[PDB]
Amino acid sequence: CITNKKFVQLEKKFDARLGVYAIDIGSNKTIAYRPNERFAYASTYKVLAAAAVLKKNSIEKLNEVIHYSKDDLVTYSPITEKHLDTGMSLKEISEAAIRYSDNTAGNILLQQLGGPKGFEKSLKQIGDHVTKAKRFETDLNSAIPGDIRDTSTAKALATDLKAFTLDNTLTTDKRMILTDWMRGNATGDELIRAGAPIGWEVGDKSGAGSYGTRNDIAIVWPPNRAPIVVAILSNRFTKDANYDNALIAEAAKVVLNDLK
């Protein structure tokens, strides 16, 4: 009950709705708050779409150069906008999507999987019947009340990230490529990483959307311990609401101190 009380008070403090699911791989202990309620996933899909692309493609296909036109570029494409001339491989596109949250990279990953519905199919293959994927960037970030397009739950996202990174669903080389892309990125510095003790390495994928949507999903490696998977999703109640990263950092501290 005590952990539940902290999450209730975070919702009051930040005027927000909060979804939490975390699993300690060593003890199987879990922490859950609104774990089955839907939130817009925003940019967090990019790590799952990248993992699905790695799973389904040979190293040869993943290194082939893709060319895209200036007309495929959507807003917030800091990496892909530089490479109209050289093109990028699916490996490079995956890294751009995960490290920098590049939206055109996200779109190319969704396209490689057969569009949003093909990405959803890839998730059903790993047992996720919850996530609903319908739109491309940047429309997928609208986070409209009552809309289930481009939504998932904290439990489903955490379970998906665990499936790709810790359940031995990718070969060692692809798995380590994926988790390295998740480590050390500025987009994650104020989120789960800000709630993790120093020395507990965090690999994450952040997200942000309308209605104050602010998300982070992560693997955490505590010293001398098995990993922890953590998904923390949040939104607010008016279209223009500004999120506060501290909500995610403070929720992550609750999770990581209690699974300690």
Residue 207 annotated as binding site: yes
**Max CA separation in the chain (angstroms):** 57
Query: Considering the rule CB under 6 A, would residue 206 count as an interface residue with ligand NXL?
Result: yes
Q: Is the CB of 149 or the CB of 225 nearer to ligand NXL?
A: 149
The Cα–Cα gap between 196 and 65 comes to 38
Using the minimum distance from each CB to ligand NXL, give the nearer residue, 123 or 259. Answer: 123
Stretch that binds ligand NXL, among 127-135, 171-179, 207-215, 237-245 (CB under 6 A): 207-215
Token pair of 132 as six digits? 């609903």
Cβ 206 vs Cβ 233: under 8 Å:
no
Do 105 and 80 touch, CB atoms closer than 8 A? yes
205 marked among binding-site residues: yes
CA dist 206 and 170 (Å) reads 22
Query: Is 141 or 151 the residue whose CB approaches ligand NXL more closely?
Result: 141
Is 206 a known ligand-binding residue? yes
178 touches 164 (CB < 8 A)? yes
Q: Is 62 in the site for ligand NXL (CB under 6 A)?
A: no
Contact 241, 28 (CB under 8 A): no
Considering only residues 94, 103, 107, 153, which one is a binding residue for ligand NXL as defined by CB under 6 A?
103
Shortest distance, position 128 Cβ to ligand NXL, whole Å: 19
Report in angstroms how near the CB of residue 7 gets to ligand NXL at its nearest: 21
**Binding residue (CB under 6 A) for ligand NXL from 94, 101, 122, 179:** 101
The rounded distance, in Å, linking the Cα atoms of 74 and 186 is: 21
* Nearest alpha carbon to residue 164 among 174, 155, 151: 174
Catalytic site includes residue 43: yes
Structure tokens at 101: 């949250």
Q: Which residues participate in the annotated binding site for substrate?
A: 205-207
Site of interaction with ligand NXL (CB under 6 A): 42-43, 76, 101, 103, 137-138, 141, 187, 206-209
Active site residues: 43
